[PDB]
Short mmCIF file of all heavy atoms in Angstrom, two decimals:
data_model
loop_
_atom_site.label_atom_id
_atom_site.label_comp_id
_atom_site.label_asym_id
_atom_site.label_seq_id
_atom_site.Cartn_x
_atom_site.Cartn_y
_atom_site.Cartn_z
N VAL R 44 57.99 -43.63 -56.59
CA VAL R 44 58.08 -42.21 -56.28
C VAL R 44 57.68 -41.99 -54.84
O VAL R 44 56.70 -42.58 -54.37
CB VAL R 44 57.16 -41.36 -57.19
CG1 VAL R 44 55.77 -41.92 -57.21
CG2 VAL R 44 57.11 -39.92 -56.69
N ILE R 45 58.46 -41.18 -54.13
CA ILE R 45 58.13 -40.83 -52.75
C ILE R 45 58.14 -39.30 -52.69
O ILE R 45 58.98 -38.65 -53.32
CB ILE R 45 59.12 -41.46 -51.69
CG1 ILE R 45 60.57 -41.50 -52.18
CG2 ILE R 45 58.71 -42.90 -51.43
CD1 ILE R 45 61.09 -40.20 -52.76
N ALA R 46 57.18 -38.73 -51.97
CA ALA R 46 57.11 -37.27 -51.90
C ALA R 46 56.51 -36.77 -50.60
O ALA R 46 55.86 -37.51 -49.85
CB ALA R 46 56.31 -36.74 -53.07
N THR R 47 56.74 -35.49 -50.33
CA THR R 47 56.23 -34.85 -49.13
C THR R 47 56.26 -33.35 -49.32
O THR R 47 56.81 -32.85 -50.31
CB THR R 47 57.09 -35.21 -47.89
OG1 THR R 47 56.45 -34.73 -46.70
CG2 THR R 47 58.47 -34.57 -47.99
N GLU R 48 55.66 -32.63 -48.38
CA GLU R 48 55.60 -31.18 -48.44
C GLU R 48 56.74 -30.54 -47.66
O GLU R 48 57.03 -30.95 -46.54
CB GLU R 48 54.26 -30.71 -47.86
CG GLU R 48 54.06 -29.20 -47.83
CD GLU R 48 52.94 -28.79 -46.88
OE1 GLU R 48 51.82 -29.33 -47.01
OE2 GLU R 48 53.19 -27.93 -46.02
N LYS R 49 57.41 -29.54 -48.25
CA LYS R 49 58.48 -28.85 -47.55
C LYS R 49 57.88 -27.70 -46.74
O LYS R 49 57.96 -26.53 -47.11
CB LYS R 49 59.52 -28.29 -48.54
CG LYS R 49 60.59 -29.29 -48.92
CD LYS R 49 61.80 -28.61 -49.56
CE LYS R 49 61.48 -28.02 -50.93
NZ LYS R 49 62.68 -27.41 -51.59
N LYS R 50 57.26 -28.07 -45.62
CA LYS R 50 56.60 -27.13 -44.71
C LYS R 50 57.58 -26.15 -44.05
O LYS R 50 57.88 -26.25 -42.86
CB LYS R 50 55.87 -27.93 -43.62
CG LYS R 50 55.00 -27.12 -42.66
CD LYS R 50 53.64 -26.82 -43.28
CE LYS R 50 52.69 -26.21 -42.26
NZ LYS R 50 51.32 -25.97 -42.82
N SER R 51 58.07 -25.19 -44.83
CA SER R 51 59.02 -24.21 -44.30
C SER R 51 58.49 -23.54 -43.03
O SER R 51 57.36 -23.04 -43.01
CB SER R 51 59.33 -23.16 -45.36
OG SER R 51 60.47 -22.40 -45.01
N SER R 52 59.32 -23.52 -41.98
CA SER R 52 58.93 -22.92 -40.70
C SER R 52 59.11 -21.40 -40.64
O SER R 52 58.92 -20.79 -39.58
CB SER R 52 59.74 -23.56 -39.56
OG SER R 52 59.41 -24.93 -39.41
N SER R 53 59.47 -20.79 -41.77
CA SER R 53 59.66 -19.35 -41.87
C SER R 53 60.10 -18.99 -43.28
O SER R 53 60.93 -19.68 -43.88
CB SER R 53 60.72 -18.86 -40.87
OG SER R 53 60.94 -17.46 -41.01
N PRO R 54 59.55 -17.91 -43.84
CA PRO R 54 59.93 -17.51 -45.20
C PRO R 54 61.41 -17.11 -45.29
O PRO R 54 61.99 -17.05 -46.38
CB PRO R 54 58.99 -16.35 -45.49
CG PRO R 54 58.79 -15.74 -44.14
CD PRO R 54 58.61 -16.94 -43.24
N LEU R 55 62.03 -16.86 -44.13
CA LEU R 55 63.44 -16.49 -44.09
C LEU R 55 64.33 -17.73 -44.15
O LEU R 55 65.54 -17.64 -44.42
CB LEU R 55 63.74 -15.69 -42.82
CG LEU R 55 63.17 -14.28 -42.80
CD1 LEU R 55 63.59 -13.59 -41.52
CD2 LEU R 55 63.68 -13.49 -44.01
N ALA R 56 63.73 -18.89 -43.91
CA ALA R 56 64.46 -20.16 -43.95
C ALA R 56 64.62 -20.61 -45.38
O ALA R 56 63.75 -20.38 -46.22
CB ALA R 56 63.70 -21.21 -43.16
N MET R 57 65.74 -21.26 -45.67
CA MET R 57 65.98 -21.76 -47.02
C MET R 57 65.58 -23.23 -47.07
O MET R 57 66.37 -24.11 -46.75
CB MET R 57 67.46 -21.58 -47.38
CG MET R 57 67.97 -20.18 -47.12
SD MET R 57 69.70 -20.01 -47.57
CE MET R 57 70.49 -21.02 -46.29
N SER R 58 64.34 -23.47 -47.46
CA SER R 58 63.79 -24.82 -47.53
C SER R 58 64.64 -25.84 -48.29
O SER R 58 64.44 -27.04 -48.11
CB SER R 58 62.38 -24.77 -48.14
OG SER R 58 62.40 -24.29 -49.48
N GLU R 59 65.56 -25.39 -49.12
CA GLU R 59 66.40 -26.33 -49.86
C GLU R 59 67.46 -26.94 -48.94
O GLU R 59 67.86 -28.09 -49.13
CB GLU R 59 67.10 -25.65 -51.05
CG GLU R 59 66.45 -24.37 -51.53
CD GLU R 59 66.80 -23.18 -50.65
OE1 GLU R 59 68.00 -22.81 -50.58
OE2 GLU R 59 65.88 -22.61 -50.02
N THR R 60 67.90 -26.18 -47.94
CA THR R 60 68.91 -26.66 -47.00
C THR R 60 68.31 -27.68 -46.05
O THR R 60 68.94 -28.09 -45.08
CB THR R 60 69.51 -25.52 -46.15
OG1 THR R 60 68.49 -24.97 -45.29
CG2 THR R 60 70.08 -24.42 -47.03
N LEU R 61 67.08 -28.08 -46.31
CA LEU R 61 66.41 -29.05 -45.46
C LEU R 61 65.76 -30.10 -46.35
O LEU R 61 64.74 -29.83 -46.99
CB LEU R 61 65.35 -28.37 -44.60
CG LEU R 61 65.26 -28.85 -43.15
CD1 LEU R 61 64.08 -28.17 -42.46
CD2 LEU R 61 65.11 -30.37 -43.10
N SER R 62 66.35 -31.29 -46.40
CA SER R 62 65.80 -32.35 -47.23
C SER R 62 65.08 -33.41 -46.42
O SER R 62 65.66 -34.04 -45.53
CB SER R 62 66.91 -33.01 -48.06
OG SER R 62 67.29 -32.16 -49.14
N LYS R 63 63.80 -33.60 -46.73
CA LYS R 63 62.99 -34.59 -46.05
C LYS R 63 63.09 -35.91 -46.81
O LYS R 63 62.71 -36.96 -46.29
CB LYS R 63 61.53 -34.12 -46.00
CG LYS R 63 61.34 -32.80 -45.26
CD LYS R 63 59.89 -32.34 -45.32
CE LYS R 63 58.97 -33.31 -44.63
NZ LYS R 63 57.56 -32.84 -44.69
N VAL R 64 63.59 -35.85 -48.03
CA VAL R 64 63.78 -37.03 -48.85
C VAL R 64 65.29 -37.25 -48.98
O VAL R 64 66.01 -36.41 -49.53
CB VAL R 64 63.15 -36.85 -50.25
CG1 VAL R 64 63.54 -38.00 -51.16
CG2 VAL R 64 61.64 -36.80 -50.11
N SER R 65 65.77 -38.38 -48.46
CA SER R 65 67.20 -38.66 -48.48
C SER R 65 67.61 -39.94 -49.18
O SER R 65 66.87 -40.92 -49.19
CB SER R 65 67.71 -38.73 -47.04
OG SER R 65 67.26 -37.62 -46.29
N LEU R 66 68.80 -39.91 -49.77
CA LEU R 66 69.35 -41.08 -50.45
C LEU R 66 70.05 -41.89 -49.37
O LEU R 66 70.81 -41.34 -48.56
CB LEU R 66 70.36 -40.65 -51.51
CG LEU R 66 71.16 -41.76 -52.23
CD1 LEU R 66 71.72 -41.22 -53.54
CD2 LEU R 66 72.29 -42.26 -51.35
N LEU R 67 69.78 -43.19 -49.34
CA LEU R 67 70.41 -44.08 -48.37
C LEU R 67 71.51 -44.84 -49.11
O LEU R 67 72.63 -44.98 -48.61
CB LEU R 67 69.39 -45.04 -47.77
CG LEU R 67 68.21 -44.34 -47.10
CD1 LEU R 67 67.34 -45.36 -46.37
CD2 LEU R 67 68.73 -43.27 -46.13
N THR R 68 71.18 -45.34 -50.30
CA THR R 68 72.14 -46.03 -51.15
C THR R 68 71.80 -45.52 -52.54
O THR R 68 70.72 -44.96 -52.75
CB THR R 68 71.95 -47.57 -51.15
OG1 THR R 68 70.73 -47.91 -51.80
CG2 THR R 68 71.93 -48.10 -49.73
N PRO R 69 72.71 -45.67 -53.50
CA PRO R 69 72.35 -45.16 -54.83
C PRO R 69 71.03 -45.69 -55.42
O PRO R 69 70.54 -45.15 -56.42
CB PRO R 69 73.58 -45.48 -55.68
CG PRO R 69 74.34 -46.51 -54.86
CD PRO R 69 74.11 -46.11 -53.46
N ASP R 70 70.45 -46.74 -54.83
CA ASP R 70 69.19 -47.28 -55.34
C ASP R 70 68.08 -47.27 -54.29
O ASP R 70 67.04 -47.89 -54.48
CB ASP R 70 69.36 -48.71 -55.85
CG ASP R 70 70.43 -48.85 -56.93
OD1 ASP R 70 70.61 -47.90 -57.73
OD2 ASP R 70 71.08 -49.92 -56.98
N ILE R 71 68.30 -46.58 -53.18
CA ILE R 71 67.30 -46.53 -52.11
C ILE R 71 67.15 -45.13 -51.51
O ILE R 71 68.14 -44.46 -51.21
CB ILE R 71 67.65 -47.52 -50.98
CG1 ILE R 71 67.72 -48.94 -51.52
CG2 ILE R 71 66.61 -47.43 -49.88
CD1 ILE R 71 68.19 -49.94 -50.51
N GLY R 72 65.90 -44.71 -51.33
CA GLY R 72 65.63 -43.40 -50.76
C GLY R 72 64.62 -43.50 -49.64
O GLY R 72 63.87 -44.48 -49.54
N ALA R 73 64.60 -42.49 -48.77
CA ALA R 73 63.67 -42.48 -47.65
C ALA R 73 63.05 -41.11 -47.46
O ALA R 73 63.65 -40.08 -47.79
CB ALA R 73 64.36 -42.91 -46.38
N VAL R 74 61.83 -41.12 -46.93
CA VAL R 74 61.08 -39.91 -46.65
C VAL R 74 60.36 -40.23 -45.35
O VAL R 74 60.31 -41.40 -44.95
CB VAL R 74 60.08 -39.57 -47.78
CG1 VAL R 74 58.91 -40.54 -47.76
CG2 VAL R 74 59.62 -38.12 -47.64
N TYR R 75 59.78 -39.24 -44.68
CA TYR R 75 59.14 -39.51 -43.40
C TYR R 75 58.01 -38.56 -43.00
O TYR R 75 57.65 -37.64 -43.73
CB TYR R 75 60.18 -39.44 -42.29
CG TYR R 75 60.46 -38.01 -41.91
CD1 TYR R 75 59.88 -37.45 -40.78
CD2 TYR R 75 61.20 -37.18 -42.75
CE1 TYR R 75 60.00 -36.09 -40.50
CE2 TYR R 75 61.33 -35.82 -42.49
CZ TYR R 75 60.72 -35.28 -41.36
OH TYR R 75 60.80 -33.92 -41.11
N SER R 76 57.49 -38.82 -41.81
CA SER R 76 56.44 -38.02 -41.20
C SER R 76 56.62 -38.15 -39.70
O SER R 76 56.74 -39.26 -39.17
CB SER R 76 55.06 -38.53 -41.60
OG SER R 76 54.76 -38.12 -42.91
N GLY R 77 56.63 -37.01 -39.02
CA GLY R 77 56.82 -37.00 -37.59
C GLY R 77 57.96 -36.07 -37.23
O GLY R 77 58.12 -35.01 -37.83
N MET R 78 58.77 -36.49 -36.27
CA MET R 78 59.88 -35.67 -35.79
C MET R 78 61.10 -35.62 -36.71
O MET R 78 61.87 -36.57 -36.79
CB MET R 78 60.26 -36.14 -34.39
CG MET R 78 59.05 -36.10 -33.47
SD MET R 78 59.31 -36.91 -31.90
CE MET R 78 60.50 -35.80 -31.17
N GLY R 79 61.26 -34.49 -37.40
CA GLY R 79 62.37 -34.32 -38.31
C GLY R 79 63.74 -34.67 -37.76
O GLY R 79 64.50 -35.37 -38.42
N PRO R 80 64.11 -34.19 -36.56
CA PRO R 80 65.43 -34.51 -36.00
C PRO R 80 65.65 -36.02 -35.85
O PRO R 80 66.74 -36.52 -36.14
CB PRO R 80 65.43 -33.77 -34.67
CG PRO R 80 64.57 -32.57 -34.97
CD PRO R 80 63.42 -33.18 -35.72
N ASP R 81 64.62 -36.73 -35.39
CA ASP R 81 64.72 -38.19 -35.22
C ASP R 81 65.03 -38.85 -36.56
O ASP R 81 65.81 -39.79 -36.64
CB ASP R 81 63.41 -38.77 -34.67
CG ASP R 81 63.27 -38.62 -33.17
OD1 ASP R 81 64.07 -37.86 -32.56
OD2 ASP R 81 62.37 -39.27 -32.59
N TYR R 82 64.42 -38.33 -37.61
CA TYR R 82 64.62 -38.84 -38.96
C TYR R 82 66.06 -38.64 -39.40
O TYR R 82 66.71 -39.56 -39.91
CB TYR R 82 63.67 -38.11 -39.92
CG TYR R 82 63.95 -38.33 -41.38
CD1 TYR R 82 63.64 -39.54 -42.01
CD2 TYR R 82 64.48 -37.30 -42.16
CE1 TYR R 82 63.85 -39.72 -43.38
CE2 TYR R 82 64.70 -37.47 -43.54
CZ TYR R 82 64.38 -38.68 -44.14
OH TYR R 82 64.60 -38.83 -45.49
N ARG R 83 66.55 -37.42 -39.20
CA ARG R 83 67.90 -37.06 -39.60
C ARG R 83 68.94 -38.04 -39.05
O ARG R 83 69.76 -38.55 -39.81
CB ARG R 83 68.24 -35.63 -39.15
CG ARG R 83 69.47 -35.05 -39.86
CD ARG R 83 69.83 -33.65 -39.36
NE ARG R 83 70.09 -33.66 -37.93
CZ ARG R 83 69.34 -33.05 -37.02
NH1 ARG R 83 68.26 -32.36 -37.40
NH2 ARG R 83 69.64 -33.13 -35.73
N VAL R 84 68.89 -38.32 -37.75
CA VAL R 84 69.86 -39.25 -37.18
C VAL R 84 69.62 -40.66 -37.71
O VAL R 84 70.58 -41.42 -37.90
CB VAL R 84 69.83 -39.27 -35.64
CG1 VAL R 84 70.05 -37.86 -35.11
CG2 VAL R 84 68.53 -39.81 -35.15
N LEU R 85 68.36 -41.01 -37.97
CA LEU R 85 68.04 -42.34 -38.50
C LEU R 85 68.66 -42.51 -39.87
O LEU R 85 69.12 -43.59 -40.21
CB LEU R 85 66.53 -42.54 -38.59
CG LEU R 85 65.88 -43.18 -37.37
CD1 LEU R 85 64.39 -43.22 -37.60
CD2 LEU R 85 66.43 -44.58 -37.13
N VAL R 86 68.65 -41.44 -40.66
CA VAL R 86 69.22 -41.50 -42.00
C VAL R 86 70.73 -41.71 -41.89
O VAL R 86 71.31 -42.51 -42.63
CB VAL R 86 68.93 -40.20 -42.79
CG1 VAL R 86 69.69 -40.19 -44.11
CG2 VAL R 86 67.45 -40.08 -43.06
N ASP R 87 71.37 -41.01 -40.96
CA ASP R 87 72.81 -41.16 -40.79
C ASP R 87 73.12 -42.62 -40.46
O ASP R 87 74.01 -43.23 -41.06
CB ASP R 87 73.33 -40.26 -39.66
CG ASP R 87 73.30 -38.77 -40.02
OD1 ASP R 87 73.53 -38.43 -41.21
OD2 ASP R 87 73.07 -37.93 -39.10
N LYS R 88 72.39 -43.17 -39.49
CA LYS R 88 72.61 -44.55 -39.06
C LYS R 88 72.29 -45.56 -40.16
O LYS R 88 72.95 -46.60 -40.25
CB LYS R 88 71.75 -44.86 -37.84
CG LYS R 88 72.07 -44.02 -36.61
CD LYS R 88 71.02 -44.27 -35.53
CE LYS R 88 71.35 -43.54 -34.23
NZ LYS R 88 72.59 -44.07 -33.59
N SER R 89 71.29 -45.27 -40.98
CA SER R 89 70.90 -46.17 -42.05
C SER R 89 71.97 -46.21 -43.12
O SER R 89 72.35 -47.29 -43.60
CB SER R 89 69.58 -45.74 -42.68
OG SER R 89 68.53 -45.74 -41.72
N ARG R 90 72.47 -45.04 -43.49
CA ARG R 90 73.51 -44.95 -44.49
C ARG R 90 74.73 -45.73 -44.04
O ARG R 90 75.40 -46.39 -44.84
CB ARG R 90 73.90 -43.49 -44.72
CG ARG R 90 72.91 -42.71 -45.55
CD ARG R 90 73.17 -41.22 -45.46
NE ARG R 90 72.39 -40.48 -46.43
CZ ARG R 90 72.22 -39.16 -46.42
NH1 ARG R 90 72.79 -38.43 -45.47
NH2 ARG R 90 71.49 -38.58 -47.36
N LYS R 91 75.02 -45.66 -42.74
CA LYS R 91 76.19 -46.35 -42.22
C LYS R 91 76.00 -47.85 -42.07
O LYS R 91 76.93 -48.62 -42.34
CB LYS R 91 76.59 -45.75 -40.88
CG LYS R 91 77.90 -46.30 -40.36
CD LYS R 91 78.26 -45.71 -39.02
CE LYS R 91 79.55 -46.30 -38.51
NZ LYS R 91 79.82 -45.81 -37.12
N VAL R 92 74.82 -48.28 -41.65
CA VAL R 92 74.58 -49.71 -41.48
C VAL R 92 74.60 -50.40 -42.84
O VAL R 92 74.92 -51.58 -42.94
CB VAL R 92 73.24 -49.98 -40.75
CG1 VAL R 92 72.08 -49.92 -41.73
CG2 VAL R 92 73.30 -51.31 -40.04
N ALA R 93 74.28 -49.66 -43.89
CA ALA R 93 74.29 -50.23 -45.23
C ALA R 93 75.72 -50.59 -45.61
O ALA R 93 75.95 -51.46 -46.45
CB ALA R 93 73.71 -49.25 -46.25
N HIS R 94 76.68 -49.91 -44.99
CA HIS R 94 78.09 -50.16 -45.26
C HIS R 94 78.65 -51.22 -44.32
O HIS R 94 79.13 -52.26 -44.76
CB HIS R 94 78.92 -48.87 -45.10
CG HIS R 94 78.94 -48.00 -46.32
ND1 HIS R 94 77.81 -47.41 -46.83
CD2 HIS R 94 79.96 -47.64 -47.13
CE1 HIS R 94 78.14 -46.71 -47.91
NE2 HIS R 94 79.43 -46.84 -48.12
N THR R 95 78.57 -50.94 -43.03
CA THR R 95 79.12 -51.84 -42.02
C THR R 95 78.53 -53.25 -42.01
O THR R 95 79.26 -54.22 -41.82
CB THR R 95 78.95 -51.26 -40.60
OG1 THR R 95 77.56 -51.15 -40.28
CG2 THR R 95 79.60 -49.88 -40.52
N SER R 96 77.22 -53.35 -42.22
CA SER R 96 76.57 -54.65 -42.22
C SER R 96 76.32 -55.26 -43.58
O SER R 96 75.69 -56.31 -43.68
CB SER R 96 75.24 -54.56 -41.47
OG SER R 96 75.47 -54.41 -40.09
N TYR R 97 76.82 -54.65 -44.64
CA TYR R 97 76.57 -55.23 -45.95
C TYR R 97 77.60 -54.93 -47.03
O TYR R 97 78.26 -55.85 -47.51
CB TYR R 97 75.17 -54.83 -46.42
CG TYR R 97 74.58 -55.80 -47.42
CD1 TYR R 97 73.67 -56.77 -47.00
CD2 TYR R 97 74.94 -55.76 -48.76
CE1 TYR R 97 73.14 -57.69 -47.90
CE2 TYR R 97 74.42 -56.68 -49.67
CZ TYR R 97 73.52 -57.64 -49.24
OH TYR R 97 73.01 -58.56 -50.14
N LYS R 98 77.76 -53.67 -47.41
CA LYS R 98 78.71 -53.36 -48.47
C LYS R 98 80.15 -53.76 -48.12
O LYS R 98 80.88 -54.24 -48.99
CB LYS R 98 78.68 -51.87 -48.83
CG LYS R 98 79.29 -51.60 -50.19
CD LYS R 98 79.56 -50.13 -50.42
CE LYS R 98 80.22 -49.91 -51.77
NZ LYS R 98 80.90 -48.58 -51.84
N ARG R 99 80.56 -53.59 -46.87
CA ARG R 99 81.92 -53.96 -46.49
C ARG R 99 82.09 -55.47 -46.37
O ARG R 99 83.20 -55.96 -46.14
CB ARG R 99 82.31 -53.28 -45.18
CG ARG R 99 82.45 -51.78 -45.30
CD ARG R 99 82.77 -51.14 -43.98
NE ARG R 99 82.73 -49.68 -44.09
CZ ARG R 99 82.88 -48.84 -43.08
NH1 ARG R 99 83.08 -49.30 -41.85
NH2 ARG R 99 82.78 -47.53 -43.29
N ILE R 100 81.00 -56.20 -46.53
CA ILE R 100 81.06 -57.65 -46.45
C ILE R 100 80.90 -58.32 -47.80
O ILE R 100 81.69 -59.19 -48.15
CB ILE R 100 79.99 -58.18 -45.53
CG1 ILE R 100 80.14 -57.51 -44.17
CG2 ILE R 100 80.09 -59.69 -45.45
CD1 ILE R 100 79.78 -58.38 -43.00
N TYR R 101 79.89 -57.90 -48.55
CA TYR R 101 79.60 -58.47 -49.87
C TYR R 101 80.05 -57.61 -51.04
O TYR R 101 79.90 -58.02 -52.18
CB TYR R 101 78.10 -58.72 -50.00
CG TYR R 101 77.52 -59.55 -48.88
CD1 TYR R 101 76.71 -58.97 -47.92
CD2 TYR R 101 77.81 -60.91 -48.78
CE1 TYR R 101 76.18 -59.73 -46.88
CE2 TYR R 101 77.29 -61.67 -47.74
CZ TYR R 101 76.48 -61.08 -46.80
OH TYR R 101 75.94 -61.84 -45.78
N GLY R 102 80.57 -56.42 -50.76
CA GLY R 102 81.04 -55.58 -51.85
C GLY R 102 79.95 -55.00 -52.74
O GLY R 102 80.22 -54.56 -53.85
N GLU R 103 78.72 -55.01 -52.25
CA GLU R 103 77.60 -54.47 -53.01
C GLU R 103 76.59 -53.89 -52.02
O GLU R 103 76.55 -54.32 -50.86
CB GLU R 103 76.97 -55.56 -53.89
CG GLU R 103 76.58 -56.82 -53.13
CD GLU R 103 76.22 -57.98 -54.05
OE1 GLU R 103 77.12 -58.47 -54.78
OE2 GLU R 103 75.05 -58.41 -54.03
N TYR R 104 75.80 -52.91 -52.46
CA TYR R 104 74.80 -52.30 -51.58
C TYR R 104 73.72 -53.29 -51.25
O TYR R 104 73.45 -54.20 -52.03
CB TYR R 104 74.20 -51.05 -52.22
CG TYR R 104 75.20 -49.92 -52.31
CD1 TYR R 104 75.90 -49.67 -53.49
CD2 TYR R 104 75.49 -49.12 -51.19
CE1 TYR R 104 76.86 -48.68 -53.56
CE2 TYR R 104 76.45 -48.11 -51.25
CZ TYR R 104 77.14 -47.90 -52.44
OH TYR R 104 78.14 -46.95 -52.51
N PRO R 105 73.09 -53.14 -50.09
CA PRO R 105 72.03 -54.07 -49.67
C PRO R 105 70.71 -53.92 -50.41
O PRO R 105 70.33 -52.82 -50.82
CB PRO R 105 71.87 -53.76 -48.19
CG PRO R 105 72.12 -52.26 -48.16
CD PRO R 105 73.34 -52.12 -49.05
N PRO R 106 70.00 -55.04 -50.59
CA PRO R 106 68.71 -54.98 -51.27
C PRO R 106 67.77 -54.19 -50.34
O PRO R 106 67.93 -54.23 -49.12
CB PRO R 106 68.32 -56.45 -51.40
CG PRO R 106 68.95 -57.07 -50.18
CD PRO R 106 70.32 -56.43 -50.21
N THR R 107 66.79 -53.50 -50.92
CA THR R 107 65.84 -52.69 -50.16
C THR R 107 65.26 -53.36 -48.89
O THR R 107 65.29 -52.77 -47.81
CB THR R 107 64.66 -52.25 -51.06
OG1 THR R 107 65.18 -51.66 -52.26
CG2 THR R 107 63.81 -51.22 -50.35
N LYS R 108 64.75 -54.58 -49.02
CA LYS R 108 64.17 -55.26 -47.87
C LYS R 108 65.13 -55.44 -46.70
O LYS R 108 64.72 -55.30 -45.54
CB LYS R 108 63.61 -56.63 -48.28
CG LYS R 108 64.65 -57.57 -48.89
CD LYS R 108 64.01 -58.89 -49.30
CE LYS R 108 64.99 -59.82 -50.01
NZ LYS R 108 64.28 -61.01 -50.58
N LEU R 109 66.39 -55.76 -46.98
CA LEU R 109 67.34 -55.96 -45.89
C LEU R 109 67.74 -54.66 -45.20
O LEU R 109 67.82 -54.63 -43.97
CB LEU R 109 68.58 -56.72 -46.38
CG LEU R 109 68.26 -58.17 -46.77
CD1 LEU R 109 69.56 -58.94 -47.01
CD2 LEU R 109 67.45 -58.85 -45.67
N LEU R 110 67.97 -53.60 -45.97
CA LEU R 110 68.32 -52.32 -45.37
C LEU R 110 67.15 -51.85 -44.52
O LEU R 110 67.34 -51.30 -43.43
CB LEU R 110 68.62 -51.27 -46.44
CG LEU R 110 68.95 -49.88 -45.89
CD1 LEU R 110 70.06 -49.96 -44.84
CD2 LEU R 110 69.36 -48.99 -47.05
#
Side-chain angles (χ1 to χ4, degrees):
Chain R
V44 50
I45 37 49
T47 189
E48 179 197 307
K49 274 197 292 183
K50 187 82 171 183
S51 194
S52 295
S53 178
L55 289 182
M57 309 181 291
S58 63
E59 339 79 64
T60 66
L61 221 185
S62 285
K63 300 176 63 180
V64 171
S65 312
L66 174 160
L67 303 188
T68 69
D70 304 326
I71 301 174
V74 72
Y75 80 100
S76 283
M78 304 169 68
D81 278 13
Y82 168 74
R83 196 183 59 246
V84 304
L85 268 176
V86 172
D87 290 325
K88 298 172 175 294
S89 299
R90 284 166 170 167
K91 187 181 179 185
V92 82
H94 275 64
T95 65
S96 288
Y97 205 98
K98 199 194 178 199
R99 292 177 187 175
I100 304 214
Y101 306 108
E103 53 191 65
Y104 290 98
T107 310
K108 59 181 176 188
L109 292 190
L110 178 52

